[model samples]
Target: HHMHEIVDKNGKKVQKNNLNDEIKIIFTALDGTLLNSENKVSEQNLESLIRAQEKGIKVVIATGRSIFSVENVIGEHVKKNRISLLPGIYMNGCVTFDEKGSRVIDRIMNNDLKMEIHEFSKQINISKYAIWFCLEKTYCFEINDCIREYMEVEALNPDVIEDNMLEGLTVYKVLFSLPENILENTLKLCREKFSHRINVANTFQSYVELFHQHTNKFEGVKEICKYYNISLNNALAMGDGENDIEMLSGLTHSVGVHNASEKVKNSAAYVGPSNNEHAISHVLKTFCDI
Candidate 1:
């Protein structure tokens, strides 16, 4: 008997699961998907997750935030052993780390590409633009005041440092933020300079991230699945950001919260309520047999 089957979105039984295996895993986004407006997981959502675990569903945290930032939200206990943390995917699908969190599986731009992008950034007269690099931790290294101002506006505390702060460290991703008008030009410059070596995409009107090749939520979840001996087709994934594109695309079953971007809602097999309304708990109770 087949262990699992693929079904059409129209409810057609194109394939059937003849084996009695539990749905193995669920991947979720931390920020807007799982966390409430205050950046904390609601009691109901947490309880639902615990229930999912009790039902033998392995839960993984898929996010673009640094491991450090995710730690604060998921709490130390969950961060330590209860879940898998997917980091270094900031601003789209730029960088990624393996399960051990020590190895780099992908990067957006190499030294040469970075140098070119940095050089181009300097020539731009706009001061609202800031360039940042993701180093060994959740801290993003920023070079100028423009980025600082933007982060302050977002209430994000990015670590500011001197140029070449990436000297001895592994750089996974780079972020650029600026006024809306200048963002397009900046992207154009990055595209013209780096070409296929990196992927430059806008996560918001004022922010853009340059990611390395082959880095996406799908890759992040794949690593987690490999570590646990699970298959991609057996995993259920969810998210609500431009960065979550690959993640939503890769899963056989995916859910998008109501607060998710239109792109995400369009991609998901099921769309639930927003996080503020405890959408996660609702979805878990509805789809999960447990």
Candidate 2:
């Protein structure tokens, strides 16, 4: 059966009908969607997720953050309760972990791309950048307030090393924080130059990230579905970011949280409540009849 909706402002709609019969998995982004304003999952959201799991529905997280960061926020609670948010997609699809926290699909940038990115970065007069090697193995040329704050936010403890130390390491992703005045121009330049070989996007306000061209939440989800023998048509996805557009639109059923930008919301078939309002919990209960 085709999906149906209830109209909302901005041409968005709230999904109707109990979709539990058709939906077998729920894929979600953590920031600004599952995580509320405080960067914490609300009690209702957690409860709803647990209820959905109890019904044999898998809840998978596809976030831009690394697995370590994901753990810093929700790992304790999930582990203590034996929750199954494992087999998660991390680093914007650069990596994926199975239910046992073992690496499933780990895609790293090649040396050629790394050298080109380094050459291209030389002209840009930005100081802050981090190269992700693996969990808790990120490296930076120097550590400053900006880097310190970023590491704290991402729950990373990177080593401050010389540029030469980058050799002989598997690079997952490269991130740079641009100044406000140059953010737009720099982002455009990077995309125009690197989009052919790499996936470049403005994730946070000042954060610009580069990954392998095929790396994205959708690709990561496809890997997970393939490994688990799940059908994409029976999965429901949700998010509230620019990077989430592909996943939201590519899936048969998707939801954009109320806090999402207009562009992001336009990509989704349905728009749910904001994260702080228990958006995921509300939508999960409605769809799964929890």
Candidate 3:
């Protein structure tokens, strides 16, 4: 059965004792949850979301993607109609936006953490690149052909970093896209050195993201719930990335798509089919009875 028993973070089966309640809000990750492997929401998936909205269930895109990127991917029409008129969280909770796309929560990384990261970054090979995401603009120390291509595909235009850039901008996330071995080693070092001082997680295959302490998707969800006066127990969260672990863990109806990392799958209450199969549609069908 796609719908199954809850499991702890360690993958051990456990009894779920929370009261069964109607799911009013559906929070979904974009890249590998709602969007299929091609990075587009399938027609089937869109239909499912439209049907859910018709039934009065809210749908929010809870993602690490910037709000601009979300609009770039889903287009404004679907975002306006099929999705919730309520706020959607972005940048892994560092930013939140209302239906009009106004910033509701604007959390920025402090200078101390940025400096610490800058100093720590020097310990690595100079060939690596550090990308900083900010409200006004994205920045990088230098750019290469590969980095340029990556930015192009992601629809990001990062200005080459200036000495005074961080001082004048609101920095939300710092990321390092690296080779597999380099990424693995740095992930260990960053977690070991700053896990207690900041929010650190592997965003995807070779990307590691650093945010201010107390920043995460779950916190973003909480902020949204507070705004709408909805209980978190009435929300259903879903994702498939390491960055999604906390958001999935904090709720009883959380789900990890079939392709989710083992750690993320373990953190979720249940597991669903792959994105290719429209996992969100299946999960919502069962949970919302749409």
Candidate 4:
């Protein structure tokens, strides 16, 4: 059996536990749900995942992070086993990969949309500048025209980009790192005004994420799971952030970890220990028999 995160950020457990099914793959969000307070996976939990890999379970990391960052965090382990090569979701759902590290589907926002966001920032006197998150080997999108003014990006880093690259760069997501006070109203207005053509999601407090209407992360999940030959009923999902609503509500065995806020906690099927407690390990033992 293979196991995946399917865990949430908070509350009571679920009604239907698919403890009896054969799992082939497991998925997790890297930051708060899977990583400990120190931003590391526990040695014990890592060993358990290693052991699960030996038994043929495919482990995948799903997050708002680019693949490079994911690799930085889990590089050593990936070198030690096949676990590292598994396909993952990047920038919500704009990116998806196959087992051999190739794209199954790649989606991006139009240049028109990128500029619209740029203009909107000045119109609203929004302090949040448009940030371009680069995927290096792959390309994450950006609307940050004030490249020199935004932040001094290191040229060599996978997450960083040279200023000139923004030229006609067709990209998927444009990030707006906003202040907390203005975040909610911003999302509300964007959703209200452009629900038909844009997707605005908040993965973090001030992370106002934007993608083309074409880039629905949950839709991307359906397409990828189909490729893996797994049905929704056979899979599991878990997360702690508010951004995980689409994921948790869609899975049959959705889980919420203790660290999640009440809203997130109440959304999942099951609520387990906090990430620091090796909560994922509990799921592996209880559900996957790892």
Q: Which candidate is the best by TM-score?
A: 2
Question: What do the candidate models score in CA lDDT, each in turn?
Answer: 0.61, 0.75, 0.76, 0.64
Candidate 3 per-residue lDDT over residues 1-290, each given as its tens digit: 43333344455443433337778888898888888877788777777888887888888888876777677677754556665534888888888877677877788888777776776786765224677888756788778764664575567667787645665666888877766667778888888989678887887767778886787888888877777778988988999998788889998778888788888888988877787888877766677765
- Candidate 2 lands at a TM-score of 0.89
* TM-score of each predicted structure versus truth: 0.75, 0.89, 0.87, 0.79
Report the C-alpha lDDT of model 2 over 1-290, residue by residue, as the tens digit: 11223234456444445344477788888878888877788888888877887788788899888877777788876787634557898888778888787777777888878867766776675534654454447777777666776776677577777766666567887887555677788888888888678888777657788887877888878878777888888787889887788888888778888778889889887777777778777777656666
The residue-by-residue lDDT of candidate 4 on 1-290, one tens digit each, is 11223333332232226366665656666767778866788877887787777887666666666676667766776777635645777777677776676777677677776667656665775523556554444332333543332232212122354444565566767666666677789888777766777777776546677775665445556666888788877666667776666676777666667687778767677777778777777767666777
Candidate 4 has its poorest 10 consecutive residues by lDDT at 149-158
Where does model 4 exceed 4 Å of error?
Answer: 1-18, 134-167
Which lDDT tens digits does candidate 1 get at residues 138-201?
A: 2344446566655543445666555565444455666676766677777787777767677665
Segments of candidate 1 deviating more than 4 angstroms: 1-22, 76-108, 125-131, 138-156, 164-169, 180-195
Using lDDT, rank the candidates from best to worst. 3, 2, 4, 1
The lDDT, on a scale of 0 to 1, for candidate 2 is 0.75
Q: Which stretches of candidate 3 lie over 4 Å from their true place?
A: 1-19, 76-80, 84-86, 100-102, 126-128
When 1 and 4 are scored with TM-score, the better candidate is 4
